[PDB]
């Protein structure tokens, strides 16, 4: 039994790099973090910032979550980051991912205490 916090870590935290390497990134990242199982996990973006500076986020601007709940945070900087989304060509157990990196502020729902990220809303 994961705690959520655990597993936003594992879905969306990658401090080990700056950036999105190859086209290449999503395929493989899915695949070790276990997200391509069961199924195609059809989108997920991760984060390439320390873990310290995303849980900061839970402090930053307080704005809806997309469900209309109120406890998502916007950051204030952009942070590095690479969206993962199945292609047409998706085919489980063939799960296949375009690779898009980017520099967008996220937005997170946090809970807890502590109070950290359990939830990926959005990048803007």
């Known amino acids: 039994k994961e705690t ?3 597993k936003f870590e594992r879905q969306h935290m990658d401090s080990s790099t700056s950036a999105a390497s190859s086209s290449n990134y999503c395929n493989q990242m899915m695949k070790s973090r276990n997200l391509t ?15 310290a500076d995303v849980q900061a986020v839970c402090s930053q601007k307080n704005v809806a979550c997309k469900n209309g709940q109120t406890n998502c945070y916007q950051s204030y900087s952009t942070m590095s980051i690479t969206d993962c989304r199945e292609t047409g060509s998706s085919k489980y157990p063939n799960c296949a991912y375009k690779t898009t990196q980017a520099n967008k502020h996220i937005i997170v729902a946090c809970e807890g205490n502590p109070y950290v990220p359990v939830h990926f809303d959005a990048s803007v």
Request: hydrophobic share 40%; charged share 30%; glycine share 0%.
């Open 37 to 51: 199982k069961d199924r195609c996990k059809p989108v997920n973006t991760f984060v390439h910032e320390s873990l």
């Open 4 to 6: 959520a916090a655990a």
